[PDB]
Amino acid sequence: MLKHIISAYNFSRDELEDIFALTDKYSKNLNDTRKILSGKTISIAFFEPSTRTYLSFQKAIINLGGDVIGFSGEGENLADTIRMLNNYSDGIVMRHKYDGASRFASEISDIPVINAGDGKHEHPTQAVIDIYTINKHFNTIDGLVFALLGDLKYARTVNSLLRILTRFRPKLVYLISPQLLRARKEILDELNYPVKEVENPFEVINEVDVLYVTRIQKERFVDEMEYEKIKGSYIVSLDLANKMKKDSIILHPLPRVNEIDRKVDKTTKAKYFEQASYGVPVRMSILTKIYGE
Amino acid sequence: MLKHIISAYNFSRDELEDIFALTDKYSKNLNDTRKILSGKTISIAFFEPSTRTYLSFQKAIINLGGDVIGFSGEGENLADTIRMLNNYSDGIVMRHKYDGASRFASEISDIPVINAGDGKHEHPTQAVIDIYTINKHFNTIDGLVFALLGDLKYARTVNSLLRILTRFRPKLVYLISPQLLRARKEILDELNYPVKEVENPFEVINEVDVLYVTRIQKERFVDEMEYEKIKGSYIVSLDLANKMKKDSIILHPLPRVNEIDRKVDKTTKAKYFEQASYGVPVRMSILTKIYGE
Amino acid sequence: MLKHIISAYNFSRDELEDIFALTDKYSKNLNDTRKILSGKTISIAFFEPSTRTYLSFQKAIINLGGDVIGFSGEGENLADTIRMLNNYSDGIVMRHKYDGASRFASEISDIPVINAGDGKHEHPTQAVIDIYTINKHFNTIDGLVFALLGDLKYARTVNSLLRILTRFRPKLVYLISPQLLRARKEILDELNYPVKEVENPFEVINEVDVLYVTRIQKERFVDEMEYEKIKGSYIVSLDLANKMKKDSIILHPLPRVNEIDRKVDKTTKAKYFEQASYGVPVRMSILTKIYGE
Amino acid sequence: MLKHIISAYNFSRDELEDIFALTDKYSKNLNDTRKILSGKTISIAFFEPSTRTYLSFQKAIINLGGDVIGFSGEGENLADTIRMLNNYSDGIVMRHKYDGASRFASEISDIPVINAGDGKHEHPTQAVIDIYTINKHFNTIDGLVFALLGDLKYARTVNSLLRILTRFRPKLVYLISPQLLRARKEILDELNYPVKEVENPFEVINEVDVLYVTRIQKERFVDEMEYEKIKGSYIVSLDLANKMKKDSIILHPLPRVNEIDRKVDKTTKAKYFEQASYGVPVRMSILTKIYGE
């Protein structure tokens, strides 16, 4: 049974399908949802701040009848902090700048720990949200052709997405990044489905069902010139959008800065706003599997 | 009757025993605790941030049916701020960097003010937690032999502890600190029980029932060398622990940094984790005496 | 005739040999050196600070009877600054953070401009010092086997060295750097002698007459781990030194940090201290060709 | 013979008397002083800035026909820096934040090194200036009664003064400081003349021939209150001045902040301005013993 949510690997195909169904139920926002967190306190421990993900979980918990305590920002030990939250609460949702922080927390902790981001490692509940969105659109995840675009090296969401896909059967996952930001050999060796590294999206854009973008950041390249020379071709432009198949979708776990042309918003292919809107019901679902079964 | 909680002196021996009993009751965490703060709003005004103590009070209040508003961090007057909280709330729990801030607040305020720390002055609800822990372990506070270890000059918790002990009859309180961090003459003259200043713990460690540690900080000594020369002997080490009596306990109001060797954690003498776990029920108790009687 | 010293390309083979002879003369520090800068003021305009190179030129100028004015550090125009120095002085020695600053200065200026470093572009008088040292040791520059070790991408001294070598006939120049810090295609296409890019020095160390090292800096790589994984093999260690031919030399334009093991200092192969000691007489020489012929 | 000037211990009684005579000569500022530094370059390497002492040495060197190069302020090695100055110059005057920097420099260096201040260790040429002033006034140093007032723990000038006095026969040296800033046991054990530690100057002020003051700084005490409680009695006030013997003198190696009441300036006992005015001729003298004999 689900307890700690630390890796996308924590989920089986069975648990995901269950979660999709519960998400469908919680989406059609009836006013009689079962208050499975009634009399329970979840702590939201965002050592590394993120207000979008903070609020998503809080709303999820509120919808389920839970009370919320937490903190955002700011030499005490992670271990000691985790022991403290165990006095105060019945589950912890944490985001942290150090890789493996959630795994370690879950080892110290008696109450469930949910990883809302650990360094550049994983963001497993995002991956659940991502594939729920895809599964909603295509009525399948199996057999789809994916393209990951942008930074594929330092993006926990990419990591969590690649790993969660291994519970399914994708036809192909294209990995479109500059040379510098390629998925780590380590991660690719875990995978059990066809992958193909490519540098320019226009070469394959016509094939993809799902285009998933992440931001590339200047403060990463050898010098500022390389970035400037490379950046313009990992932007989702209106032209790139128009070259996609009719039934294709564009995803992005927010926030965006400038990596998506805002004109894309108005095309029917843009799915990133719908993606963010499932954040709450999906996380309601995950919480329901942890505490309500 | 209890109203403002500003000093450990606010408590009588009678009120403390009552609080211990209520703490015992709230500890055995029944789901039918009386919601004495129902329809009431407590504001948590942490001008000086502390997340551990913030969350402790919030949980206490939640457990009692109260609503929580508050702030942590950040040229308005303390007085004006206190007047504002009186519009918004039915009690204030404040922590502040200025000594006497709680006393002054309680003079401006109609609603109860609870001191969660005022400069280097006091931390009275911590002292209640400290002695509750001791009384739980030994079934008494009278007749015990104490040793305060670390910084005994600038530690509000030490101050509050020394003052609260005067409602009891300790056999002896050892004051083990470097020369620089001795309890202030002012404070020691208030006391009504034997005290003895000493510099090295191993000289008396065999006698103490309760060892209570605080951190010594570099940014205090004449130069960085003195600190480095003195610091290693106010650390609670495994060796010091092993030299304590079988039935003795080690306390520390968290957070710790490095002043306790982490191997101590695994000995049965370590009581600082149990100490932190009474934070909520003890503060529930104090709130119950203020609003529920 | 020599006037502006902006690129290593400003020198012909003839001018270099002349400079070597004058350097030999000025080295044997007679007290009757001709005061060719008597009644002249050279300004030392170090917009980007460097005290080693500042002092080197100043001493050179002093030895030649010149007066020195200048500045080091600190929205006025470069052009306007250059116009100002033309009021005050008879030559300018400048170091600047912007590439091409010396070239531009020399276009605005009537008086000679000497480039003591322009961004990551060139450091031409260093290259003169470097080859003078080599020519002193081997009685030749032609036919030697070189190895450049460390950062070969962002090092003006490397740039100036590679370009100055084209007035000679090196047997081979090995380019030993991590993949990231390879000499720029642009620069390599200028060259008229065999070059060979290699990643590990121990593969070829046995062949080199001249080993020339530059520092690799963390703040350049994809992440801090790559640097840490790569850095230890571009360090000149005692082992690498011992593997060099008996008559071989190790050069480095100072300062060093940790890129040379300090035990190397005591071997007869270490030539970087001798290299720095020719700084003055070489620059005396260059000044002599500009003003004394 | 004098070469490196690193400690007040470098001077014998004989060398000091010689220096006093040369200072007398250079004081009566004749325009035919022998240019003993003609054709020589002294470098002034002030790693830790001080403009007063910088300018003093520079003027000394100028008066003696020397050329001056140097720097003030701003990961190169001290050793490497010292090796560089040896290329460029014939002597080094250095001030540095690290104790023992001058001693180490003088070990690396072939040319003379003069310590113009090394951390909190020594300032030996100041001590020469101090005793020259005293000897000028009283025609003796032997048999005088001294009082050191202010910070006697972290003041290199005090250190250098105490050590230089051991070449003489003081009747008594009073050490007047707050408890916290007492001369170090280490230093006092070196001394060969009566010393007496005292806390308040008015207790002994009537006996002293020479009152030598240093500043006490806030950023040193246990807390800001202690400083404020102690500071007002290590100030040289008009009252303290008036209580001194008719023929007594007040010294201070500048700069001052507020540790001397400015009304003292107008009394005939104030000697700190005369003290600073011997800086040049005294340092001329020291240079003369190093290079002109």
Added chain:
Amino acid sequence: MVSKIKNGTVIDHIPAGRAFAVLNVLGIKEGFRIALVINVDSKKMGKKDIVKIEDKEISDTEANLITLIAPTATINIVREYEVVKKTKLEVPKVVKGILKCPNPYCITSNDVEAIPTFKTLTEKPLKMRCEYCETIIDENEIMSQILG
């Protein structure tokens, strides 16, 4: 060159110079007798080191940690003067404590209680994986961590 042991563990066939690292690997550096010989002759290896620990029998778990720096090594358990056991050294599945994670952002590189933990990924060319952050280390990084 060192006398025989009445009861305990003999670790023979350590590469020359590496005995000190073996003891570190084992956490030994108190009470019980220890003998080392360093740089002694070895017919099959040229030079070797031998470690002898009285009154302690190293487990197969403790023992496998040795293979990280001394895969040639042989472990003998000694009782009453007789060698009662000659352990088969294997590459350990998990390494807790001995190896640090090169990732400065790894939780194990920051929290004192977060003890570094590596799981062997392949024995073949030896690659190990940090269980917290997934960073991979090779035999080089491993040996340069323990040996120097």
Added chain:
Amino acid sequence: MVSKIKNGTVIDHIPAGRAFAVLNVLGIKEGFRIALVINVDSKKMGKKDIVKIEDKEISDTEANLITLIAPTATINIVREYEVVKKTKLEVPKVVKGILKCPNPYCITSNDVEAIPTFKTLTEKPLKMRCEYCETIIDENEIMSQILG
């Protein structure tokens, strides 16, 4: 418990557990055989350690450094199997390299080439003085630096 040595140095009567520190003190940790026994019986000391270094004769200078952590120690120089010399251990006048200066502002604490140097001030109660900054260290600070 370790065999006799044909040629070299035997350092006997080291306090129990301190042999490793003796080797550090000597800069030894290559080529030549070394033997240690740790925690062996000693009639006069209860327990002791013995170090044996083949083919090296420790000088009176090197030897005196041992007195800092093993003042009881006895140094035997061995040739052809015969002990040809039994050194009188003395408190060394100067200690270069082994001990660091506790003053963070000492030049020896900042410049890699500035090697820490202590001059013995009194042997009696052992006090040493940093030659650069005059900081004083006692036997405690000395032993806690080398032993741990």
